[PDB]
């Protein structure tokens, strides 16, 4: 296991889906907020689903 800063890891994965990494470094803040909000709604979804 080789340690790597987490934003650079996500930049690699962005390359993996055909989007250039500059797109990630310029929207880091917004992306982080979107990810946090989604994770927050996951638990609510699990709890509300019968």
């Amino acid at each position: 296991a080789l340690q790597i800063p987490f934003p650079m890891q996500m930049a690699y994965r962005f390359n993996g889906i055909g989007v250039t990494q500059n797109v990630l470094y310029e929207n880091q803040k917004l992306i982080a907020n979107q990810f946090n909000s989604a994770i927050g709604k996951i638990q609510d979804s699990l709890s509300s689903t019968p």
Binding site: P7, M8, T20, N22, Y25
Partner: protein, 56 residues
């Protein structure tokens, strides 16, 4: 373009991800996008241009 910016303490290099092979940072293996104040953790260094050494 491919790899990661790796510095060995005093100098900066570009190297392919899965095997250490440092190269000089030049205009050929990098691409530009916008001004340099929005990206976090950016550093400073000389980016050589191969057209200058020819000096026609």
């Amino acid at each position: 373009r491919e790899g990661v910016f790796v510095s060995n303490g005093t100098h900066w290099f570009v190297t392919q991800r899965n095997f250490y092979e440092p190269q000089i940072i030049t205009t050929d293996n990098t691409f530009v996008s916008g001004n340099c104040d929005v990206v976090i953790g950016i550093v400073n260094n000389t980016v050589y241009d191969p057209l200058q050494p020819e000096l026609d």
